[PDB]
Design a binder for this molecule. Sequence first.
Ligand SMILES: [Zn+2]
Ligand SMILES: [Zn+2]
Length: 264
Amino acid sequence: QTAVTAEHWVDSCADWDAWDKPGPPFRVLGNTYYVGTCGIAAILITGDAGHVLIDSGTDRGAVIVRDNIARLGFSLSDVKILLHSHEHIDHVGGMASLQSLSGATLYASPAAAAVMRNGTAGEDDPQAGASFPVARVGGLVNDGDQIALGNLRLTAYATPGHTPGALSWQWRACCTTLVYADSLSPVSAEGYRFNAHPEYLQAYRLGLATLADLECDLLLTPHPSASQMRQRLSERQSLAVPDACRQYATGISARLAQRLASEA
Ligand SMILES: [Zn+2]
Ligand SMILES: [Zn+2]
């Protein structure tokens, strides 16, 4: 009838907080929970035949994710499937620790699977320049592929640009359609330059135009402040906004247009 631990989250976590700062878990909607840190998001989706967990945070943030899952009363061994947003250390750095202690099978896009297998980028990664423990990928996720676990059902959408193998996940919670849209930010390491890889930008455009048109009632981001999750939690009754994915993707296209303006 209102938050309850999401109110505690607003009091405990700030906007653009530290990646490894401990934070409380709260319920997003129905079977979907937030189990991430104050700076890095981790999405837990519970079902009758196990749970799905998206993203791990860093190797230090995975300790907070493990704690937050236990705070809600859910068993880590009941986490049967691990998913990812994109293959950066602040989101999948502790994936190997969560996979080892839960026994879940980790699904990843081909480009992300190479990073998890090697523990590092990644020639075409815009931020190629910290390594993390290697993880065991059990399945490959392509564009439009579905993930099934009992009554749970998630569909992935290849939305590269921030990373070559970034994914955006969409599921239903009972209804409401939630979308875990990737960071998609036109950020990179100094000296990478976006305009040098036009093969990388057309696919960037293709995923952005796909994300904007997805059925999308509630928006979630690996960096919570990317979708103003804290403001939506503090200001309103629900996290769901009409045209949430349409506004977010248009904002990314605006940032991308200004990023390509810094070419010359
Ligand atoms: Zn990133
Ligand atoms: Zn990040």
